[PDB]
Design a protein around this ligand. Structure first.
Ligand SMILES: NC(=O)c1ccc[n+]([C@@H]2O[C@H](COP(=O)([O-])OP(=O)(O)OC[C@H]3O[C@@H](n4cnc5c(N)ncnc54)[C@H](O)[C@@H]3O)[C@@H](O)[C@H]2O)c1
Ligand SMILES: NC(=O)c1ccc[n+]([C@@H]2O[C@H](COP(=O)([O-])OP(=O)(O)OC[C@H]3O[C@@H](n4cnc5c(N)ncnc54)[C@H](O)[C@@H]3O)[C@@H](O)[C@H]2O)c1
Ligand SMILES: NC(=O)c1ccc[n+]([C@@H]2O[C@H](COP(=O)([O-])OP(=O)(O)OC[C@H]3O[C@@H](n4cnc5c(N)ncnc54)[C@H](O)[C@@H]3O)[C@@H](O)[C@H]2O)c1
Lengths: 478, 478, 478, 479
């Protein structure tokens, strides 16, 4: 499979970098180089931001479109992505090491449902008419914010981009996007379909490059109105801070978590075992929603640990293009070493290994730690790799205090047949999403986001539209 | 003056340092009293009080939704009871005409409280259609402990715009008034205790910016901070939030608000509205109409009648029945104003009245400048004083570009009888509020806030609830 | 306690019937006459409708009020009802035979919560701004429907009146009310409070009288815009048909039902026994929400029947004014003879009397039927008196078909600890309200109403506002 | 004409009676085909089929929300693929200019389908805060089996305004097109089947009013009905609904809609708008501008410019690219109109053009303008539904308000003025479901439509349409 699109994307034309520089992207499954990609910088960002400003200029074609046509263009874009679903899944797998079937049936399915879902909102973005006084007409407009910058991570490259572009374009904004340096490939392909669908030049522009260079340039730009970042807490902090330093641009942040997973005695234990396994080990464990703190009630603890080890010892690891591969390699050696060091962490600290604990190329064998306590490091640091740490609890209100004691709050899951327990837990957990008797159940129509240091604002759902619009009161006196 | 101490757990406290700052009457230039000077150790005590008041099982948490509303109505009952006392303190602290604080500043607080009293049992999440065997819904939960930082120009009302939605939504608060204007907030606490609010739901720490405010903005257990004040400090607040615990942030900041006048318009209506829109609150108001664009056909007549309005504006003792304009807040502001006046002369604008102080005394003569251009300082910097600069224009598409030329975007006003002209302008002005044939037309039910660098979220109306709640998704598999 | 209000209420003035006729109202507790009431007719109706028309006329004081003042007037009325709480409760007990404490702590509490809840909606009824084309402004108004008529039954006189008047006034309509002929007293007393709160003349008018006479004049009236009826299916059918044949006025109906009460094996039996008993015998069983069909899984059945009988054998029956009286007399002899004929029915048909079955005065003692089948009379006909029948079932899917087997669908209740059983039943029961491990849990903020033949619109919650507003599209082109 | 039979369970059926009725082209004045004549026993079978398809556990009920939407998009794709065929039949059955049915009627169907396609995964209930230990929420469930009864003036489009929201929300349907205009509905049935809607989700029974329509409105297992047609039959529908099972009812009825012209209006813009608003679809329109109030001081100049617009309006064969007005729908309407015209003279209005038919053979009526009209005349009170523009005269805004609100009708209103306050004051005072300003017939799938007072009950189009096709359930849980 050959990589067509490697340049910078602006006014629906392909540009090479002003500096002339280029950077490489590698296949984590072979460690070998894939291609060279134009490396943009502050000069390239400036150009893209101009373009998106002109395309947003009042009187521009994009602004003159009627709402329903914005939806038509997103439905066409989604049509093209379905036409080329296999290519895109494959570019994604070469760049991230993800199983091809996971790329094809998950990442791409999510991009199409998201794109279609927000095409549906485009003529349904409604403000309000407000009663005040007898002789007054007062109403509200949900106007487009303007120029929106988007900065995405390496673990769900295409999908995270789509979570932003889909509501942004639906609402009538324009965009300058920046993929992670590790994985520019799909984003760039997508830009080819954006031309082929009909989007007027300048509505979407794309500058690949590095964090402290292209990304900082966006976050600090004086004529970008709004920025949406998905990635690490560390960088999220800087992005909000550069945003406020510069022009006070609006900010959406989705960051990581140490997400709890609570198993009650009265759970259906195999559903629970099955979902905590999938929740830990999906996408090589390199996923923001990973189920990295599994609390089990004392009475079913050993039976839970046992059954989980079976699942982990039997999980096929290999070449992501093999159809039976359920786990590929980590993204690169930098993550590889990060993970194994943290396994040492728990060894060094008293946790009980039950399987794995070593490498196997860039593969790490599925690892289960038994008998984990809150103060351990694999219990407080997001591991972001195939490591399942299992803890033990006695009380319902005990487990609540313990799950809520991190600084983060992205996700939680609870497993029980008991109506009163499921709901009482769902209300008390400080989490952006609480799954009950399921894990990784995501929907285009259900909002997603963090409490606390897991982030700001929401993506997906009707709630995404609040992030891409500016509210205007018009008040008329008679 | 009865209330001077730090308010925590419905109790009055001396500063942990024992220090005290003085508050002063800008009319008499005499000192009203001394107020406890808080610092970070005081803020810690208040935040802890608000945390405890917010734990699950807490009296405040276990209250009915509708009970929260009844609590807000009883408070608004109390403010209406002590309405004259409160308006009186506010006039002492700010120099504001007593009748203005009584019929405007105080009237806003009672209706704001009443409006948000009615929202308590109407904060509604969503139930979301997904799959045949899935129940998925969203809950609008309180963010938690909420910080307010308010300015000196509308001390009690800018307070209430924050306190009122916050409580309605079930949060707790730590409030910091401006060092110049602490009294009303300290009095409001006593009414909160008399109203039956459980202790710790509201805590008030008076003191200063780089001290108490900075403590509030970077605290690790404040979840959300709401700021009204200057742009320079708003940036600092958001930076502190971004760098501490990523707390949610609302900003209401200033503006350079245009006031557009077509030859079409009711000139008598425009001249008074523009006049009241520049001079209200001694010009010290976020919504001040500091850039009056007039169509040349009616230009000179506008200047003539505005000059008359200004020459006849009664300036004097705020407590006298007929005072329309009191003294500026303090000597720092006073000098700021005269210095910007002078720059206008030095740069070529045409003085038509005022330009001077009066009895040295903190009063400034109502000042009108004609022949103003966009490059001038009196046309770009926010004066916060009784200075009305009048500009000139010819075409509508010319006026739009000139008005949107700031980095600000709080407020705009348009005067015309032409249906299409009115609506075209309402759509094109990049401002949070566009008034048509009125000015300063504010309602608890219409939201308020800035485009661009004038601010971030919204206060008042239904949109204010967005800023004091967190969206959780609960997804259940069957 | 002496009745003060006996006459017809129109333009805030008391009036004798045009005919001079009057009808008596009697105390079921005694069988004796309480007083005489002016009996209106089509002539008096016509006069009331004109009052409502003039007060709803454009430019009238009522229409000139701002929305938030409609709220104040509702808060003021609620305050009056709370001030005279015990008197209204007593008038209602005199007229219905209801326990005073039930009149005081339920009926009246529901009136005060409803008045206050809909006071909060008045300045919060919002239409929409709709995006279409570049040069078009389109928005909607939720305008007031106009003159609304309201017709209530005898079993909750004040409460059912309030359920219509609170949302109707909240949205700015005007009304003509009609109590049941059996209970006019409290409706009329309320009218005196309406004058005392400050509602403009004509906003509310009351014309007591009989169904086919005053009630038909309302349903048929060419200048009433909306009718809201609570009562019998038979009369509800006629009201809708008269409304259609006349002027096509809008219609709300809340009718009766045969409401199922489903008990699973894993239910908390004592809770389930407690609520199914209370849900049958509340208000002497004379309740639209009554649990006249109790399905039990045949593992707990006899143990359910047993404990049920203990509850029925000891529920104290006596003078509604005695503190410990939990069951008063039936509304009159006509209702009395309906129930005990219906008992006979079940005897013939093979049901097992477990207790009761006889009279004692106008009192019926708690009667429980066991071994009850779908085809029995007491399983299909609304008993509307203290008769608890108990059925038996094996499957979830069986009980689902059997409960939906009616033409009615007002309420349902479900008892189980099982998360999946609760929700499955909740989604599958064709009922306007489904309770889970509770019964008769009503809130001002939660809508109420019927599926199928149990009713049409909804009452309470935001959803009631739809029944009292008319939608207008305004579309402007530039 | 490939499709003439009864559509039930995505199959085709002959009437149980074996009877058929004729449909005829109002331009040829000849018969197009025969269509099965249904009666109650066929409506029972269709209703039955709609129930089984609606049973819990049925395919349609197990689809996820988004796939319901994907189906509606898929059907809108087919309507656009066969756009010409569908617009043609419509012109054959109605007399409508082909180009009007292609660019207006058929375009409204595709946008309506596509707008409500997007709503299927966005029908959102509420969660309600009550007590510390209570979970309370609402669900917006499908009402169940829905029946539609549509008129002959916009056959396909009035059908789609009903089918689209209903399907979106997961209902099933029994449709009945008007006996004059069955063809498009039966063609639609094929496209619903080719789109892969499960059998029974949509069922179509052609036939007559006191027959099939009455059978539908009184059916004990139809849960909800949506009716567009005349007021007199709308009353009958609601009555039958009340006598049977209290099924929910939506009514879109007629109007006598005012069109108000201020002196400060763009007169050229008002003239054409007023003209196209009276004469569209040969005047046979619920939105028709059947009462043109003009201010005295542009009055006679308005009349002058309208006459010119009328005398130059090309009447003729609907398939000629330059026809702007075809023939009336049949002889019955034809006589209605002429009989209302003559009474116009009898009562003293000033004919200014038209007032007669044209051919001896044809069903064409000359564009007819009346001046010097007054509120008491019949052409000012009764709905003409034909090419007749009566122009009235007024002085005051408060006077024009009272006069315009004086009907029992209240569907639609139009105001022409440049004055911001005049515009908005009238928009609040006019008791009408839709008030246009400086435009006419400005309809969008996103904006609701329907009557005040006797012009109807509910709304169609916009989010408000979903309210008529769902049933609200509260679920309250105690902990
Ligand atoms: N040495 C450490 O302590 C440490 C800790 C954690 C992660 N890391 C490194 O960061 C990576 C985390 O992976 P990730 O992509 O999911 O999260 P990330 O936050 O590092 O990157 C997310 C997105 O933000 C961009 N970005 C990075 N820095 C930016 C900046 N200052 N301004 C604007 N944008 C910026 C990135 O190019 C990317 O597109 C790891 O590969 C690891 O090498 C290092
Ligand atoms: N051109 C200038 O010299 C300039 C510029 C900006 C601000 N200021 C000062 O601010 C005042 C403007 O009036 P204002 O009250 O409306 O705006 P402000 O900037 O002083 O902010 C007002 C509120 O924010 C608080 N605050 C101040 N500094 C803070 C900090 N570092 N962190 C957290 N909170 C802080 C203050 O206690 C006050 O309650 C002026 O009087 C002036 O002294 C001056
Ligand atoms: N006042 C009048 O003069 C007047 C007005 C309108 C229609 N009509 C006559 O009605 C016929 C159709 O005109 P229209 O389509 O505009 O209005 P309409 O109300 O008669 O028909 C609309 C729809 O309702 C159906 N329908 C008719 N009677 C029904 C009934 N009893 N029960 C259930 N459904 C029924 C029809 O088959 C059609 O589908 C014409 O023949 C016309 O002459 C007369």
């Amino acid at each position: 499979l050959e990589v067509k699109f490697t340049k910078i994307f602006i006014n629906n034309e392909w540009h090479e970098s002003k500096s002339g520089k280029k950077f490489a992207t590698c296949n984590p499954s072979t460690r070998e180089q894939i291609c060279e990609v134009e490396e943009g910088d502050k000069p390239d960002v400036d150009k893209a931001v101009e373009a998106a400003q002109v395309a947003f200029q009042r009187g521009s074609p994009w602004r003159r479109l009627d709402a329903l046509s914005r939806g038509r263009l997103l439905h066409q874009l989604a049509d093209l992505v379905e036409r080329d679903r296999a290519t895109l899944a494959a570019l994604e797998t070469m760049d991230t090491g993800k199983p091809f079937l996971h790329a094809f049936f998950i990442d791409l399915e999510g991009c199409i449902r998201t794109l279609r879902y927000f095409a549906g909102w485009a003529d349904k973005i409604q403000g309000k008419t407000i009663p005040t006084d007898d002789n007054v007409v007062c109403f509200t407009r949900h106007e487009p914010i303007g120029v929106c910058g988007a900065i995405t991570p390496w673990n769900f490259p295409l999908l995270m981009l789509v979570w932003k572009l889909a509501p942004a374009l639906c609402c009538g904004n324009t965009m300058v996007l920046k993929p992670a340096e590790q994985t520019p490939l799909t984003a760039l392909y997508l830009g080819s379909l954006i031309k082929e669908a009909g989007f007027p030049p300048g509505v979407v522009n794309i500058v690949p490059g590095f964090g402290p260079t292209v990304g900082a340039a966006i976050s600090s730009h004086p004529q970008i109105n709004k920025i949406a970042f998905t990635g690490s807490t560390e960088v999220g902090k800087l992005v909000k801070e550069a945003a406020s330093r510069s022009n006070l641009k609006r900010v959406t942040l989705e960051l990581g978590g140490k997400n709890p997973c609570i198993v009650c005695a009265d759970a259906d234990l195999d559903l629970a075992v099955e979902c905590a396994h999938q929740g830990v080990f999906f996408n090589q464990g390199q996923c923001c929603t990973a189920a990295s703190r599994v609390f089990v009630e004392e009475q079913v603890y050993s039976e839970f640990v046992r059954r989980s080890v079976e699942y982990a010892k039997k999980r096929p690891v290999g070449d992501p293009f093999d159809v039976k591969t359920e786990q590929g390699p980590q993204i690169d050696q930098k993550q590889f070493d990060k993970i194994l060091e943290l396994i040492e962490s728990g060894k060094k600290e008293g946790a009980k290994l039950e399987c794995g604990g070593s490498a196997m190329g860039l593969f790490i064998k599925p690892t289960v730690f038994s008998e984990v306590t809150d103060n351990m490091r694999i219990a407080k640091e997001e591991i972001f790799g195939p490591v399942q740490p299992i803890l033990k609890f006695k009380s319902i209100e005990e487990v609540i205090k313990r799950a809520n004691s991190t600084d983060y709050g992205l996700t939680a899951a609870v497993f029980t047949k008991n109506l009163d327990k499921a709901l009482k837990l769902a209300s008390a957990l400080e989490s952006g999403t609480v799954w009950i008797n399921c894990y990784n159940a995501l929907y285009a129509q259900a909002p997603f986001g963090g409490f606390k240091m897991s982030g700001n604002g929401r993506e997906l759902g009707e709630y995404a539209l609040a992030e891409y619009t500016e509210v205007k009161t018009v008040t008329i006196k008679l």
